[PDB]
Every structure is written in structure tokens, then in C-alpha cells.
Design a protein around this ligand. Structure first.
Ligand SMILES: COc1nc2ccc(Br)cc2cc1[C@@H](c1ccccc1)[C@@](O)(CCN(C)C)c1cccc2ccccc12
Lengths: 41, 45, 191, 75, 132, 38, 95, 74, 44, 223, 77, 36, 75, 75, 75, 75, 75, 75, 75
């Protein structure tokens, strides 16, 4: 998985680690919402 | 912002043109005195 | 002689032209850098201390402003003041004018002077015009009247009461009032 | 029964009529803001008219409300 | 309550007079000024100025340019660069110069000079509409 | 309303996350604007 | 490495000239054209392409695309060329 | 490459790995990009062909729905 | 570009297929019309 | 029958929706070169203009979302524009994808507003020059609006794009039904359809811009 | 306009009976490739070429079919 | 090298004035949006 | 007995029409505020017009109520 | 007899349409106030224009009322 | 006979839609009054636009009326 | 029986929605009158913007006629 | 039952009165924008008026809202 | 069946609410005309704002359509 | 059997109340355009107020929508 570490994650590291952390909290919220919507159906 | 202000003119030029137009529409009895009492003589160096 | 007779309506005009700036009480900015200085006089000498006094005031306050850092550029209406001041203040000099005095000064002259004062690219942030206020046949006084730009008349919070005002109408009013004050001084200095 | 049901429906459809008073109050106070920003020397007098305007537009609204309470509680 | 000062560069029509209404053709439209009118300051365009004296009688002038200023103390200063009473203008010269001006407009194509032509055209149109 | 059929929701969520957050941003990081020289 | 100065000479924005030249020898000039017309006829004849509202939305969006291309192709092409040549001129001046 | 080979073993001789077909797709994309897009004096056809193929694909799966709107039944 | 005379086998295929299609279409149309109207009437 | 172009597309049993969603980035090629072709030149110019438009109003912390917001507008615009092709399945007509684009961004926004600056973020609920006697009621509205701002985002996209398509499709049927009837009427309805297609292009771009602008404003109010 | 007709009058015309000899000759050539199996001798380029020409003659057959039933879209009834 | 064959890294090598400040500005576009 | 139910429903639907008069009075008095903030020495005549506007706009509203009182009792 | 009920409900619905004429008369006379406070020398022509606008707006409103009375009485 | 009853109710509901035309005509002629007070020299051309405006909005209104009759008389 | 009835009722209610189109066209052409009285040199650009507003308006209307048709014919 | 049904219909109808408050808040804050663009040195006072207008206009809406609840749960 | 009947009625009633977006788009483009006649040097930025305004106002109306379809098809 | 039908009808009648927010957001952004064309040096501050107005106007409308679902899904 070389160039998957370097071309795919080395660029997105400063964002996926520092800037989009609250984005990931919100994405967990959204996943919970979607799971609850699909559960009541 | 009028059209002449977009065209680069200023209100002094607008006023000069409108006053010249008003004087040019004066009847010949007053026209000479009008352009003479308002004619310009200053010149730029 | 006749100039005193034509000074009455021109004085009423030019004084009603500046009643706003004393009713609105515009103080002008003492902080900005650029500065314009118009000196009104004639071309034909044998008049005594007219041009001498004009030059005194011009160079005096030019030094007074250069001591504060404000860039002052000179305009001379009349060949006498231009020839007197061209010896020492020539780089600080915008433009000068001719044929002032031979014929009685008319509004066309002031309009031309104001046009050339605008079509010169000098972004003057404040100005002053210096003329010879006529009091009686024996005495006159060297006076100066201020000239405000757009940014000081538009930002003055005393102009917040004036309705239907934007930057364009203020620009037009400032240009016409420049022409008006030049005409007032040109009618005052001939007498 | 059917009559009480329609009484509820009519009371609702009647009290819909307060939208006009809402929009009128909005317009009155909007023009009050504008006219006070234009001529702040007349504030008091201007405000007077504003009150009147409000007290009149809302007035019509009351009519709607009351006629609802004529179908809903009176008859 | 109104202090009307109507003046041209060489002539004074009113000075501190108390007229009741003045109708002026500002560049941003025409408006009539009565006592205690909201303070304003405007620049004029060619057109009539109707001054209503306290007697209800009207005086009609034709101003070419200038500035109107209504102040906080109900003082009005109207300065017209060329204020001519209607008894001095003619219709034929106005219409002929309008002809000329529209002609050189359809002839000319540069922005600044055609702008000057348009200003002359609208001045002469105001003249025609003012006389009749 | 076919938008309400929640059985095909994940099929719409996971590829979007691969595009909005990984592929489009990666292609943006390759669009660089150098500073002007002297 | 430098870029070539021309593309692939596509006819009608859909079919490249390599196809026309490949079909030229055996069936002449009208070969590809008659093949295309026969294909469209067999498509909308055996209900392969069934007419629907999508037919007219397709015609509409294709007309808008063709008009927008024919009206703003020169403009955008010269705009891109001028952007590139402005950048090149600035870089040559800063040399 | 094909269009000159005339043997069936070729069809299985190729690299039918996920990486293999991925590299095949990448090479096809790069050939198309170099031919029609990655040239100066470029044209819009380099995009209209892609859009036409996208329309063909988007119609191909939409045929199961459009078949219920035929005006013939044969 | 000058025209290209087509191989005669291709022209033969073209026109023979055209005529075979004309025949097939006419015969199948006259074959399906009676069944068509039959089922149209039987549907009501 | 009518909503058929909004059902998840499947060919040969496989969900082609993933390919349709992953295709948009294929239209934005990139190059390391200094002078490149017309496509990349125009695209980099567009990205520069878009970033200058959306990002100039932020402080130095809001500008760290430049990649996110620019890639978001580039993704939504490209999706909506590819959705206008004939028979195309537009994944932005889906409430699922739009909710998954709306909830993470808004939630991360309010979370970064409540982790730092939480005092000022809570003061934002009460405007500055607010008189006191009825402030509790203004507490009810703002919060509940904040509680519906994410959904109000997604629907604002969905209920728009869907509707547009529906309208076009319906008007299309009109022409077809009037194809075998008076033809001048068909040409009038087709001119209506052409105006509607231009409006749909404009609305595609406008919906992209407004989605990303509302996310940008939520972010600005929390940084 | 007339360019279409100018090009068609050479290849888009009925085959003269004088060229049916070499027509059945080309048929004999292809059937000899069937006899020995010379389609193994065939590379992909002209193979797909011949396939496209066969598709074209099939479209001729289908155009004849749609003109044999006087209806474009399917059978009218 | 002519500018038609030049890479952005080659431009940063020849003109050190154009290299982006990947340390003062770590995130895209690695420069102030105004100067962009 | 369904007719009386519909009488209630129609009376409510009729009296919803007063929203127009509400918004019209609001607009009239907002414009009075503005036009007075501009030129206050006309305070008399302006108000006159305002009254007229009101006295006309509100009139339309009354018509709505009238039809309400025509369906609710006169039938 | 459900038709009597439907006639009542339809008359109420139709007379809802007078809100438009109410708001229109409000806007017309408000703009008369504004345009007169600006240029009070054109009082006569401005009033004539206001009469025209009021006539057209109340004409649409009376169209609504006439439809109401036509459903309610003349079938 | 529920069909004719609902045709009545639908005609009423459809003709509700004339309020928009009423308010639009109001706004058109109000703005005509204002813009003529500002620049009374263009009295002619302004009025032309007014008619155009009054012709378009009212057009939409008439559509409602047409639709109303289409639910009341045609089918 | 009741289904076609409710279809007529819903069709009327749906075609109500073009009142907003009427009011929007009114406001658009009113502001065209005003902005042309202000700057009579931009007549062509102002008319273009007015045509754009009228288009977008009749569009939001078509959104209502769509649901009217869908209720009436293609349920 | 027919009472729960019409209580639902009545609440749903009554809660339309919030349209007036929506439009009134819109007008109040638009006029606040305009009055601030005119006289920005009164930014405090202006805003106060805005809030007042808001707190009044929405108030009417609230009335409508509670009426709905009043006929849904209370009686 | 009365359920589908009320589905149609509620769909129509729901899609009534696009009049607001019609009027709002009218207002936005009229104000664009005005603000462009007052400062034609900002033609771009003004238009930008117009876009935003449009895209928000129209948005609200589409919400109505949503509920319409949410009632008409998805129960 | 009929309570669900009336739930549909009440949901439609409730959600029609978004026209107010449509018109209000239109007014807010039209006034933003105008006020910006007058004083384009306050572009930020004006915009701020616009958002506020928007965030408030829309708010009211969403209330209606909420009630819709509270009648359509809760009870
Ligand atoms: C001519 O009027 C238009 N101008 C437009 C301008 C811009 C745009 Br983008 C769309 C426009 C659409 C139309 C009509 C139209 C004509 C033909 C087909 C479709 C739409 C219209 O939609 C009127 C608009 N109102 C009413 C919503 C309509 C719809 C349905 C039935 C009608 C019956 C009679 C008259 C007009 C009818």
C-alpha cells in the first residue's frame, strides 16, 4: 500500500488530523442519524 | 452615477455644456451681452 | 469702479455658496498629507502690495505646512504671483494661468480654472485659496478660504442630517463649489 | 357532531386573517425606521404616526380574531 | 420661515426672501421645497425653477446648472450658473440646436464626445419642454 | 417518493464521502498558484 | 516535454476522423454516414431508443449546448490562450 | 496491443488482476487525455465525447424503465 | 475527396438485404394485423 | 412511473450510482507544468476566482477551510451540471447524499464554535442591541433555527434540483402529447422548455454556490 | 445538397448485373476462408472492419423492413 | 529552460521569489486569499 | 345540517379577506411616516390623503366581513 | 343537499380575493402620499393617477366579489 | 352530486388567486405615481411601462378567473 | 365520486399559487418604472432585468401549475 | 369521530397567520438595512426600532399559533 | 376512499404556498433594477446579491412543494 | 378513517404558511441590494443585517413547517 500512504494520506494529513476533526465528530453524528432513520423503517 | 460621470466627465464640464446650451437658445437681443458677461478669457500655462 | 458694482451680486452668490460649510460647520482634517494652495492675483503690476501680500501668505503657510509634513502643491491664478513665487517654489507648483485682470473676471474663467484643477490628477485632500478681500477704497485684507475634498465632507458626522446624499452628489457639489469659491475670489481680488 | 367540527374549521380559517395585521405592523415600523433615519429631528412626531398605524392595522386583525371567537364560542 | 437665496454668478433674484415653495430640477429628480423641508444638498440639471411667493403668485426662471442647498434652519440657497427668465429664450434656436446635436450624435461614435453631445441634447430637450 | 427508500442510502453516502473528502480535495491540492516573480 | 499543437480532429464533436478514415477504403465516403443512419433507424425502429419526454429534454439540452458552444467557443478559447500568453509574457519579462 | 494480434490466448494472456485492469483503465485514460485534452489549441470535443459516452451509459441502465413506456407491443 | 467504388459483394448484400427486409416486413405486418385486431376486440 | 429518474440506478444488478457519484472529479485534470492546455487553464482560473469569492470574508482560522469549501462548491456544481444530461441520474436529488453533505459540515461548524469561543458563540444567540424585557422568546427561535439549519440546507438543494427535473420532464411530456396535434403549439411549448433548460443550468450553478455560501456563513459565525 | 447525390451515384446505387460475377467471386473468397479456416489468418483491424460492413448491410435489411411495413416505429398495429 | 517545458518546482528553483511559504501558511492555497 | 356547517366554514373563509385591508392600512401609514419625514410642512394634506387611503382600503376589508355576515346569518 | 353547502364555501373562498384589492389600494394611496410629499406642485396629476390605480385595483376586487355573488346566488 | 359541489368549491378556491393581480396593479400604479413625481418630464414613457406592467400582472390574474370557470363550467 | 371531487378542490387550491406570480410581476415592472425615472439612459438594461424578473416569476408559477395538473390528471 | 378531524383541519388552517409575521419581519429588517445605509450614525437607535417592530410583528404570529394549539389540545 | 381525497386536497393546499416565493423573487429583481439604476458601476456585485436573494426566496416555496409531494405520493 | 384524511388536509393548510417567509426573505435581500447601491462602503455591515433578517424571516416559516409535521406525524 505504498503511494497509498504517500499520494493519498500524506497530502490529506494536515487536514484529516487537525482541520477536519470536528468534521469527523459531525460525521459520526450523521451516521447515527442515518442508522436511526433506517432503523425506523 | 450618471452616464457622463461614467464617461469621465465632471460636473464642471456638464455645467459648461448646459450653460452654453442655454445661452445658445437666447434670443439675439440678449445673446451678445450674455456670452460677453460669461465668456472666458483665462488661459493655461 | 465698475468692479465694485459687480462685486455686490457676485458677493451674494459666492457667500451663499459657502453658507453650507459654516451651517454644517465642516472643520476639515488637520491630519491628512496632500494639500493644495491657490493664490489669486492679477498680471498687471503698479498695484502696490497686492501680489506681495499674496506671496507672503502663500510661502508663509507653505513653510507652516511643510514643517508639519503636509505636501503642498501651488496654483497661481495671475502671472504676478506665479512670477514672484517661481523663483523659490517651482517644484511645488501645479499650474498657473494667464489673462487675469485685463478683462473683468467672469464665471467662464472660474469654470476653466476649476476644470484644469480637476483634470490634473492631483488628488488634493484639502486646499486653501488666498485672495484680497476688499473692504473699502483705502484698505483690503489678505484672506484665505478653505476648500474641502469629498472624503472630509462625506465623513463629517455633521453631514448625516442632509438627505438624499451619496458619493456622487457630494462629488458634483464639491466640484461646483470649487468653481464657486474660485469665482468669488476672482471677483474680490479685482476690487 | 358536524356543527362543532365546522365551528373549529371556521374559527381557524377566520383567525388566518391576522396575517394582514402582521404585515401591516411590519411595514409601519419599517417605514418608521426609514423615516427616522432620514429626518431624525422629527422622531417623536414620526413615532406618533407609527403608533397610530400599528393601532390601526392591528385593529383590523382583532376583527378577524373576534369573529373567530364568534363562531368558536358564541354560536 | 423659509429664507430663499436665488442667485446667478452676476445677478441676484431673491436674497433672504420669504417665499413659501421653490420647485427645483435636481439631477436626482425634481422636488418642491417648502418650509422645514428635510436638509439636503443637490446639483441641478437644466430646467424650470418655479418660486411661489407668499401671495400665491409664481415666478418662473430657467436654470442651467448649479446647486440647491436646503439647510437645518429652513434656509435655502439656490445658485444657478445661468438663470434666465423664460422671457429671454426662444423655441426655434433650441429646436434647431437639438436637431444639430442629435445629428452629430448619430454621426459620432466615441464615448466622451458623444457624452457631451448627450448632455447638450438633454439640455435642449429641457429647454423645449420648458418653453413649450 | 423514491428518495425515502432508506435501503439504498449507504450506496449514496459512502462514495460521496470518497469524492467530497478524498478525491476532489486531492485534485484541489494539485492546483497551486505560485507567487509572481520580480 | 512540450504539448502537441492539435487534438484529434473530431467531427461533430462526437466521432473522430480516425473512424472515418478507417471506414473510408472499403465503403467509400458515405460509408460511416449510412452506417450511422441505419443504426439510428434500427434503434428508434425496434424501440431500442424509445421516444419519451426525455427525448425532448434531450433535444432541448443538446440545442442549448450546441448554441452555447457555437456562441462562446471562440471567446473562451481566445480567453484561455490570452491567459497563457500573458503568463508567458510576464515570466519572460521577469527573466 | 490488439488490432494487430490474431490469437485467442492473448485474451487470457493479459494481466487480469485488480491492479492489472486498474492499470489498463489508467493507460486508456492517459491515452485519451494526451490525445484530445492535453494539447495546446485544444478543442471542446475532448469533453463532448466524454459527455456522449456518459449519456450512453446513463441511458443504458435507464432502459429497464423506458421499456415500460413503449407505444408498440409487436 | 473522390468517391470510392464499393466492392460488389457489399452492394449485393446491401440491396438483397433491402429487398428481403421489404418482403419480411410486409408479410409480418399482414400476419400481425389480424392477431392485433383480434386481441384488441377480445380485450373489451 | 414519474419519479423513475430518481430511483437508484442499477445495471446488471450492480449499483452504478457509485460510478455516477465518483465520475465528477474525472473532469478536473491537474498538471504540475507551468503552462498547460486550455482546459486546465480555464479550470484553474475558475478555481482561483471561486476561492477569492468564498474565502476573502474569513479570518485566518476560517481560511483553513479553503480546501473544504472550494472542493465542496466544485463537487456540487459539477454534480448538478452533469445531472442535466439526458436520462442522467443526479445524485444531488437524493435526500441521503444531501443530508450527508449538510450534517457533517454544519455539525463541525457548531462544534468548533462550542469548543473554542463558546461564550461568544452563545452570545450570538442574543443580538447586540437587544432590549431585555422579551429576550427569553428570542432564545426559543434562534436555537430551534440552529437546530434546523442542517436540514434546511439539504432540502433546499434536494427539493430544488428534483423539482427542476420534474418540471422539465413534465413539460417534455407536454410537447410529446402535442407533437401529434397543432404544431405551432408544440413549438411554443418547446420554446418554454428551452427557457426552462437555461433556467435549470443557472439554477444548478446557483444551488451549488448557495449551498457552499451558507456553509461559509455558518463557519464565519463560528470562527 | 448535390454533394450527397454526387457521391451516392457511384457507391450508393443498385449493382449492375455485369458486376455480379465478381460479387459472387468475393462471396467465393469469404466462403474459401470458411472452407480452410483462413479466418485464423485474420487480424483484428480488418476483422472489425468486415464486422462493421456486415452491420451496415444488416441496417440495409432493417431499412428495407421499415419500408416494407410503411411505418418507422415498430408495427403500427 | 523555456517556460513551456518548465515545472513549478523548476520555477521555484530558478526564481526563489515564487516558492510558496508552506511554513507560514500550511493549508491550501498556502498564501493569502487576497494575493491569490 | 351540513349546510349550517358550511355556513360556518364559508364565514371564516370570507372573513380571512380582511388581511388585505390590514396590509393596506399598514402601507398607507408607513408611507405617511415617510412622506412626513421628508416634507413636514404638508402635515395637513398628507394626513388627508392618508385618511382617504385608509378610508378606502379598510372599506374593502369591510366588504369581506359583510359577505361573512351575509353567509353566517342572512342564510 | 350538499350543493348549498358547496355554494357557501365557494362564496367564502371567492370573496377571499378582496385582500388583493385592499393591499393594492393601500399601496396606491401610500405612493400618492410619498410622491406628493416629494413634488407637491403636481397634486392634480398625482391625484388623477391615484384615482386610476385605485379604480383598477378595486375593479379586480369587485371581480372577486362578483364571482362570489354569482356562485352564491346565480349558480 | 358531490362532483358539482366540489366544482363549486374548486372554482371559489381558484378565483382566490386574483389577490396577486390586485396587489400587483396597486404596486405598478403606485410606483408610476412616485416615479412621475420624481422625473415628471417622462410622463409619457413611464405611463407606457405602467400599462405594460398593468397588462402583465392582471394577465396572470385573469388566468385564475379562466381556470375558475374551467372548473365551474367546462369540467 | 369523492376522488374526482377532491381532485377539483385540490386543483383550485393549487392554481391559487400564481397570485404570487402576479404580485411579483407587478413589483418588477413598478421598480422598472421607478429605476427608469431615476436613470433614463439605462432603459435597455433595465428592461432586460425586468424581462428576467418576469420570466423567473412566471416560472415559480409553473411550479404551481405542475402540481395542479398532477392532481387533476396524473394522480 | 368528526371532532378530532376538524380540530386537525382547524389548527392547520389557523397556523397560516404566521405568513404575516414572516413578511413583517422581512420588511422590518429590510427597512433596517435601508435606514442604516442612509444614516449609519444611528446604528443603535435604528436597531432598537427594528427589534420593536420584530417583537411586535412576530407577536401577532404567535397569537395565531396559540389559537391553533387552543383548538388542538385545550378545546 | 376519503384518505386519497384528502391527500389531493392537502396537496393543493400545500402548494398554495408558492405565492410567497413568487412575490419575493419579484421584489428581489425589482430592487436589483432600482439599485442598478442608482449605481450602475456595481452591476456585478448587485447582481450577485440578487442571485442569493432569489435562491433563498424561491427555496421557501419549494419547501411547500416538498410537503405537497410528501402528501401526494409518499403519504 | 377520517382522522388521517383530516391530518393530511391540516398538514397542507399548515404548510401553506411559508409564503410569508418567502416574501420576507425577498424583501430583506431586495432592501440589501438597494441599501448597498446607496452606501457601498458598508457592504459587510449591511450584509450582516441581511443574514439576521433572513435567519429570522425563514425562522417563522419553518415554524409552520414544524407544525405541519407535528400534525402529520405526531398527531
Ligand atoms: C406565455 O406564458 C408563459 N410565459 C413564460 C415565461 C417564462 C417561462 Br420560464 C415560462 C413561461 C410559461 C408561460 C406559460 C406556458 C405556456 C406554454 C407552455 C408552458 C407554459 C404559462 O406557464 C403561464 C405562466 N403562468 C400561468 C404560470 C402557462 C402554463 C400552463 C398553462 C397555460 C395556459 C395558458 C397560458 C399560459 C399557461
Amino acid at each position: 500500500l505504498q503511494s497509498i500512504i504517500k499520494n493519498i494520506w500524506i497530502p490529506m494529513k494536515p487536514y484529516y488530523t487537525k482541520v477536519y476533526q470536528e468534521i469527523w465528530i459531525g460525521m459520526g453524528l450523521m451516521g447515527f442519524i442515518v442508522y436511526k432513520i433506517r432503523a425506523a423503517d | 452615477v450618471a452616464y457622463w460621470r461614467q464617461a469621465g466627465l465632471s460636473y464642471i464640464r456638464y455645467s459648461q455644456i448646459c450653460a452654453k446650451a442655454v445661452r445658445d437658445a437666447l434670443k439675439t437681443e440678449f445673446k451678445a451681452n450674455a456670452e460677453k458677461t460669461s465668456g472666458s478669457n483665462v488661459k493655461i500655462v | 469702479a465698475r468692479a465694485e458694482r459687480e462685486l455686490k451680486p457676485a458677493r451674494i452668490y459666492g457667500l451663499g455658496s459657502l453658507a453650507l460649510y459654516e451651517k454644517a460647520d465642516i472643520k476639515g482634517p488637520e491630519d491628512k498629507k496632500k494639500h493644495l494652495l491657490i493664490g489669486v492675483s492679477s498680471d498687471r503690476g503698479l498695484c502696490g502690495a497686492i501680489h506681495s501680500s499674496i506671496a507672503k501668505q502663500m510661502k508663509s503657510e507653505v513653510a507652516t505646512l511643510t514643517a508639519a509634513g503636509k505636501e503642498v502643491m501651488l496654483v497661481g491664478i495671475g502671472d504676478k504671483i506665479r512670477g514672484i513665487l517661481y523663483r523659490t517654489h517651482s517644484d511645488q507648483f501645479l499650474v498657473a494661468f494667464k489673462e487675469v485682470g485685463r478683462k473683468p473676471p467672469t464665471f467662464g474663467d472660474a469654470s476653466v480654472i476649476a476644470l484644469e484643477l480637476l483634470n490634473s490628477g492631483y488628488e488634493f485632500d484639502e486646499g486653501s485659496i488666498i485672495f484680497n478681500k476688499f473692504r473699502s477704497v483705502i484698505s483690503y485684507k489678505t484672506e484665505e478660504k478653505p476648500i474641502f475634498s469629498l472624503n472630509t465632507v462625506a465623513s463629517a458626522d455633521s453631514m448625516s442630517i442632509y438627505d438624499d446624499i451619496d458619493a456622487d452628489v457630494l462629488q458634483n457639489y464639491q466640484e461646483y463649489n470649487l468653481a464657486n469659491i474660485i469665482y468669488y475670489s476672482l471677483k474680490e481680488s479685482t476690487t | 357532531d358536524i356543527d362543532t367540527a365546522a365551528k373549529f374549521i371556521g374559527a381557524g380559517a377566520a383567525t388566518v386573517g391576522v396575517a394582514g395585521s402582521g404585515a401591516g405592523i411590519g411595514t409601519v415600523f419599517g417605514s418608521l425606521i426609514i423615516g427616522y433615519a432620514r429626518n431624525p429631528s422629527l422622531k417623536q412626531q414620526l413615532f406618533s404616526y407609527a403608533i397610530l398605524g400599528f393601532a390601526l392595522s392591528e385593529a383590523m386583525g382583532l376583527f378577524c380574531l373576534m369573529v373567530a371567537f364568534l363562531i368558536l364560542f358564541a354560536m | 420661515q423659509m429664507s430663499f437665496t436665488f442667485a446667478s454668478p452676476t445677478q441676484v433674484f431673491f436674497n433672504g426672501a420669504n417665499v413659501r415653495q421653490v420647485d427645483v430640477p435636481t439631477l436626482t429628480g425634481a422636488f418642491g421645497i417648502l418650509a422645514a423641508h428635510v436638509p439636503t444638498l443637490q446639483v441641478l440639471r437644466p430646467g424650470l425653477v418655479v418660486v411661489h411667493a407668499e401671495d400665491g403668485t409664481t415666478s418662473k426662471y430657467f436654470v442651467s446648472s448649479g446647486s440647491i442647498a436646503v439647510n437645518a434652519d429652513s434656509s435655502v440657497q439656490l445658485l444657478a450658473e445661468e438663470a434666465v427668465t423664460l422671457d429671454m429664450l426662444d423655441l426655434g434656436a433650441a429646436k434647431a440646436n437639438l436637431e444639430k446635436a442629435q445629428a452629430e450624435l448619430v454621426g459620432t461614435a466615441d464615448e466622451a464626445t458623444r457624452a457631451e453631445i448627450q448632455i447638450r441634447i438633454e439640455a435642449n430637450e429641457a429647454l423645449v419642454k420648458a418653453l413649450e | 417518493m423514491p428518495q425515502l427508500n432508506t435501503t439504498v442510502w449507504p450506496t449514496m453516502i459512502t462514495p460521496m464521502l470518497l469524492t467530497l473528502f478524498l478525491i476532489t480535495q486531492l485534485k484541489m491540492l494539485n492546483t497551486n498558484y505560485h507567487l509572481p516573480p520580480s | 516535454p512540450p504539448l502537441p499543437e492539435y487534438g484529434g480532429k473530431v467531427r461533430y464533436g462526437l466521432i473522430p476522423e480516425e473512424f472515418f478514415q478507417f471506414l473510408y477504403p472499403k465503403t467509400g465516403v458515405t460509408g460511416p454516414y449510412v452506417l450511422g443512419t441505419g443504426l439510428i433507424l434500427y434503434a428508434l425502429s425496434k424501440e431500442i431508443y424509445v421516444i419519451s419526454a426525455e427525448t425532448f429534454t434531450a433535444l432541448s439540452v443538446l440545442g442549448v449546448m450546441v448554441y452555447g458552444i457555437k456562441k462562446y467557443g471562440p471567446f473562451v478559447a481566445d480567453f484561455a490562450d490570452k491567459l497563457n500568453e500573458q503568463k508567458l509574457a510576464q515570466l519572460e519579462e521577469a527573466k | 496491443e490488439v488490432k494487430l494480434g490474431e490469437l485467442p490466448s492473448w485474451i487470457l494472456m493479459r494481466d487480469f488482476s485488480p491492479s492489472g485492469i486498474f492499470g489498463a483503465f489508467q493507460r486508456g485514460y492517459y491515452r485519451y487525455y494526451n490525445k484530445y485534452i492535453n494539447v495546446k489549441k485544444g478543442s471542446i470535443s475532448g469533453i463532448t465525447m466524454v459527455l456522449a459516452c456518459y449519456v450512453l451509459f446513463s441511458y443504458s441502465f435507464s432502459y429497464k424503465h423506458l421499456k415500460h413506456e413503449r407505444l408498440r407491443k409487436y | 475527396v473522390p468517391p470510392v467504388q464499393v466492392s460488389p459483394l457489399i452492394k449485393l448484400g446491401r440491396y438483397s438485404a433491402l429487398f428481403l427486409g421489404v418482403a419480411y416486413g410486409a408479410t409480418r405486418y399482414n400476419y400481425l394485423k389480424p392477431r392485433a385486431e383480434e386481441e384488441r376486440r377480445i380485450a373489451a | 412511473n414519474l419519479f423513475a429518474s430518481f430511483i437508484a440506478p442499477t445495471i446488471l444488478g450492480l449499483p452504478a450510482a457509485v460510478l455516477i457519484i465518483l465520475f465528477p472529479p474525472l473532469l478536473i485534470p491537474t498538471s504540475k507544468y507551468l503552462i498547460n492546455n486550455r482546459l486546465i487553464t480555464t479550470q484553474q482560473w475558475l478555481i482561483k476566482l471561486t476561492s477569492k469569492q468564498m474565502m476573502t470574508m474569513h479570518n485566518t482560522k476560517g481560511r483553513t477551510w479553503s480546501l473544504m469549501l472550494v472542493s465542496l462548491i466544485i463537487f456540487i456544481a459539477t454534480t448538478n451540471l452533469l445531472g442535466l444530461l439526458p436520462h442522467s441520474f443526479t445524485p444531488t436529488t437524493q435526500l441521503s447524499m444531501n443530508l450527508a453533505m449538510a450534517i457533517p459540515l454544519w455539525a463541525g461548524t457548531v462544534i468548533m464554535g462550542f469548543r473554542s469561543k463558546i461564550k461568544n458563540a452563545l452570545a450570538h444567540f442574543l443580538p447586540q442591541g437587544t432590549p431585555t424585557p422579551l429576550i427569553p422568546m428570542l432564545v426559543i427561535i434562534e436555537t430551534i433555527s440552529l437546530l434546523i439549519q442542517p436540514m434546511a440546507l439539504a432540502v433546499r438543494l434536494t427539493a430544488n434540483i428534483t423539482a427542476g427535473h420534474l418540471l422539465m420532464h413534465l413539460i417534455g411530456s407536454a410537447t410529446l402529447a402535442m407533437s401529434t396535434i397543432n404544431l405551432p403549439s408544440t413549438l411554443i411549448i418547446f420554446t418554454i422548455l428551452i427557457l426552462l433548460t437555461i433556467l435549470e443550468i443557472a439554477v444548478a450553478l446557483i444551488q451549488a454556490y448557495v449551498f457552499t455560501l451558507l456553509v461559509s456563513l455558518y463557519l464565519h459565525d463560528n470562527t | 445538397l448535390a454533394t450527397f447525390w454526387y457521391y451516392a451515384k457511384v457507391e450508393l446505387v443498385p449493382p449492375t448485373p455485369a458486376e455480379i460475377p465478381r460479387a459472387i467471386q468475393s462471396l467465393k473468397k469469404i466462403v474459401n476462408s470458411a472452407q480452410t479456416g483462413s479466418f485464423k489468418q485474420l487480424t483484428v483491424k480488418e476483422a472489425v472492419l468486415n464486422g462493421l460492413v456486415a452491420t451496415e448491410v444488416l441496417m440495409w435489411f432493417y431499412v428495407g423492413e421499415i419500408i416494407g411495413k410503411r411505418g418507422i416505429i415498430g408495427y403500427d398495429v | 529552460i523555456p517556460f513551456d517545458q518548465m515545472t513549478i518546482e523548476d520555477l521555484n528553483e530558478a526564481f526563489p521569489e515564487t516558492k510558496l511559504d508552506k511554513k507560514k501558511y500550511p493549508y491550501w492555497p498556502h498564501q493569502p486569499i487576497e494575493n491569490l
